[PDB]
A paper describes a structure:
To get a better picture of how the substrate and product bind at the active site and probe the role of Trp-116, we synthesized three mimics of an LTA4-GSH adduct, termed analogs I–III. We solved the structures of wt LTC4S in complex with analogs I, II, and III to 2.75, 3.2, and 2.9 Å. The phenyl ring in analogs II and III were added to increase the visibility of the acyl chain that was to some extent disordered in the analog I complex structure, as well as to stabilize its interactions between the protein and the acyl/phenyl moiety via π-stacking to Trp-116. Analog II showed a higher than expected IC50 value (>10 mm). The binding conformation, however, remains the same for all three analogs. Examination of the active sites in the five analog complex structures reveals a shift in the binding configuration of the GSH part that is similar for all three analogs. The corresponding distance in the structures with analogs I–III is ∼7.8 Å.
Leukotriene (LT) C4 synthase (LTC4S) catalyzes the conjugation of the fatty acid LTA4 with the tripeptide GSH to produce LTC4, the parent compound of the cysteinyl leukotrienes, important mediators of asthma. LTC4S is a trimeric integral membrane protein and a member of the MAPEG (membrane-associated proteins in eicosanoid and glutathione metabolism) family, which also includes three microsomal GSH S-transferases, 5-lipoxygenase activating protein, and microsomal prostaglandin E synthase 1 (9, 10). The crystal structure of human LTC4S has been solved and identified a unique horseshoe-shaped conformation of GSH bound at the active site by residues from two neighboring monomers. It was postulated that the lipid substrate LTA4 binds in a hydrophobic crevice between two monomers and that Trp-116 could act as a “molecular ruler” for binding of LTA4 with its ω-end buried under the aromatic side chain.
Residue numbers in the entry:
A (entry chain A), B (entry chain A), C (entry chain A): -1 to 146
Write the structure that this text describes.
């Protein structure tokens, strides 16, 4: 047997996320051409700095997303986690587009991405609680018993 | 039984990648001493900014590499994925060395790293397609059948 | 059967790490308000630049930590890896607090975080060596045998 089936949606969402990050990167290179900024050096016009910063921020959050997606998907529920992941990634795409246009337009999709991510966290937390708390509670009761 | 055997090459390549990242970090600290830059603050001579930026970029791509390596290795083929990973990591080492010497010398190994990574993506995509597409196609046919 | 049991501590430490990263992020937003820095743009007073840089560095190391935690936990020993992970994360929290106050105060917890992480690396390396080296050594002997 294989456990590919138990994680395939997580893997698909993960790959989609990688692809999205790649898209962000190409958008950064394109802003580097458009606004004439050569590597190294990450300062230039406001629009470049916004696109660049949107990419940096997405990159910074991407491992957090992956970690929680997987923990939630394995410990809580695969489908829920994948859905939350899809919502998160879509929110991040909109974040990147907004930020690229204006700092303020990054905000609505930013909030959406954050809501989905904390939800992923909550599912992870609940799943882990479900795993550890019963055995822990039993062990505590046994020690009390004890009396006897 | 354990699934360590099914992922050991992925794990080895992963660890090698971590080690390589550590190497990049130590190279950055060494440039911080050589070109007299004290934390925080990441601006200084061109050579420092290049070494620093090479490290930043490698760091930024490292989770993307890990994600795709694992998805490709689990869904497509472990050995192929690990090989692509090795090529990628070697390419990144050369990227870092080039960039450290000159922005332009970062370019050839950069292209090599990108080719290997998209290959990892393609293997991931193919592996996932192989997982989902048959069941999906069957389900679609069944709905057509239906007639009857 | 499920392998949740074999990775639950790794998952818990991972989630704790994500939560800690989130904390760092909120601390950065709070410094953005306190020291009046609006996105994009990551320059401002020294204290902001230190908090920001502490967050950036933690973010940069977080995937390395995750990779090694998991490899060590799967290939060497789950409990040891999780413990090292806890020590690492605590060290990083102290790192962030120190850096936030003064660059120099980042140093002691920084060294602690590095010691724990290399230990994670060593466990990963030993676990992987244990997996590959016997089969490899046998294969080499068989080829020698050979004679005959
Ligand atoms: N923020 C960018 C860094 C990333 C980027 O936009 N481009 C990549 C290469 S983009 C090529 C295609 C996308 C890469 C990839 C990644 C993950 C999966 C698929 C494709 C890069 O290596 N830039 C720095 C350099 O030239 O050394 C920058 O610093 O300029
Ligand atoms: N780009 C660097 C950040 C990383 C770096 O080069 N050094 C590490 C520590 S390097 C020590 C050895 C390598 C760390 C490690 C990581 C992963 C696996 C093994 C070893 C660091 O913590 N720098 C910032 C700081 O002093 O607070 C910088 O901002 O100066
Ligand atoms: N270093 C920060 C980036 C991250 C940060 O501090 N805040 C997050 C949002 S913090 C909200 C709560 C924490 C997010 C989260 C992440 C992981 C798990 C749980 C919660 C952010 O999106 N900043 C940039 C922007 O406004 O576009 C900066 O560039 O200002
Ligand atoms: Ni199994």
């Amino acid at each position: 047997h294989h456990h590919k089936d138990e994680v395939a949606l997580l893997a698909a969402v993960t790959l989609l996320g990688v692809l999205l990050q790649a898209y962000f990167s190409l958008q950064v290179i394109s802003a580097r051409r458009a606004f004439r900024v050569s590597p190294p050096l990450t300062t230039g016009p406001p629009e470049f700095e916004r696109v660049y910063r949107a990419q940096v921020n997405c990159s910074e959050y991407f491992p957090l997303f992956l970690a929680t997606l997987w923990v939630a998907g394995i410990f809580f529920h695969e489908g829920a986690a994948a859905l939350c992941g899809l919502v998160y990634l879509f929110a991040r795409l909109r974040y990147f587009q907004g930020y690229a246009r204006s700092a303020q337009l990054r905000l609505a999709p930013l909030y959406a991405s954050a809501r989905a991510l904390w939800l992923l966290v909550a599912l992870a937390a609940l799943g882990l609680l479900a795993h550890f708390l019963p055995a822990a509670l039993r062990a505590a009761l046994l020690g009390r018993l004890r009396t006897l």
